[PDB]
């Protein structure tokens, strides 16, 4: 398929790797009894391994010649061959949480900046204001775009300190 | 150092006829430390030992020489 890779559901090395992991786990399990805590723990780990391999093959991931999955970072290839869940959707998810945290911190700084002692509000966190801004940050992309359109997101050149060149 | 390590390991695995070793161990740093730096230095540090020496002893002396200069720096 893409870049000479084969799907994990039809790769021989993938199945051999799964059999290798299950074989070493079963080999470690043969030394214990049947109704003991280590045996139950090993069986739980084996079930987790089976579920993980089944879920990875079910997701349609592309495996290589080593039997391990590969991620598709190109937006066109991901949206064209059903690989948007690898690197596209998590990218936008991180962008939302990253801008979320950044906007919450920026709002807290700008809010405490006009007070009498901002340094005290920086070392001793004002939990009520921080909690209110944390709950209000859900609309961070909308607020950031509206701030950018109004011209209030950036500071002017004359109000920023610079070197003597 | 990173570019030369990459070049040396990829070409070593190509010349040895096993590029899969590099393809499977170049994703984790343990593979770089064991399969490349530890696996390829067995003959180097064996240039001179109590059992004798060979033509590779000068490189072993140079290896320790560089380590000493680095530590002196």
């Amino acid at each position: 398929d893409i870049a000479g890779l084969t799907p994990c559901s039809e790769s021989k090395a993938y199945a051999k790797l799964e059999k290798k992991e299950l074989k070493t786990l079963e080999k470690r399990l043969k030394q214990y009894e049947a109704d003991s805590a280590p045996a139950v723990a090993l069986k739980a780990t084996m079930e987790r391994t089976k579920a993980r391999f089944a879920n990875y093959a079910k997701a349609g991931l592309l495996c290589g010649n080593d039997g391990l999955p590969h991620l598709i970072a190109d937006p066109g290839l991901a949206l064209k061959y059903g690989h948007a869940g690898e690197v596209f959707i998590p990218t936008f998810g991180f962008l939302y949480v990253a801008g979320y945290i950044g906007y919450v911190g920026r709002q807290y700084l700008i809010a405490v900046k006009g007070e009498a002692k901002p340094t005290d509000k920086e070392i001793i966190i004002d939990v009520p204001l921080a909690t209110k801004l944390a709950w209000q940050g859900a609309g961070w992309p909308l607020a950031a775009v509206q701030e950018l359109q109004r011209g209030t997101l950036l500071e002017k050149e004359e109000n920023i300190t610079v070197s003597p060149r | 150092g990173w570019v030369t390590f990459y070049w040396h390991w990829k070409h070593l695995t190509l010349w040895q006829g096993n590029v899969a070793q590099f393809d499977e161990s170049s994703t984790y740093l343990m593979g770089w430390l064991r399969d490349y730096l530890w696996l390829n230095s067995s003959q180097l540090i064996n240039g001179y030992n109590p059992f004798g020496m060979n033509s590779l002893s000068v490189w072993a002396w140079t290896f320790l020489f560089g380590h000493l200069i680095y530590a002196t720096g």
């Binding site: 004359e158 109000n159 920023i160 300190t161 610079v162 003597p164 060149r165 | -």
Partner: protein
Amino acid sequence: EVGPKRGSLVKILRPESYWFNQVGKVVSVDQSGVRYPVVVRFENQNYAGVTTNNYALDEVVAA
């Protein structure tokens, strides 16, 4: 009476100053013919831990 009013806020125009392009509160303006009569106090300290300095009449702009 010459210079900025006491207690006002002015911007520093001295390039080599740590508070260049920064706002500071006016403390006192010397009435003699000294080169730097304006005294400006800043909330943020410099690398030496100083918050006050002396600037000239043209080195400060009202802002």
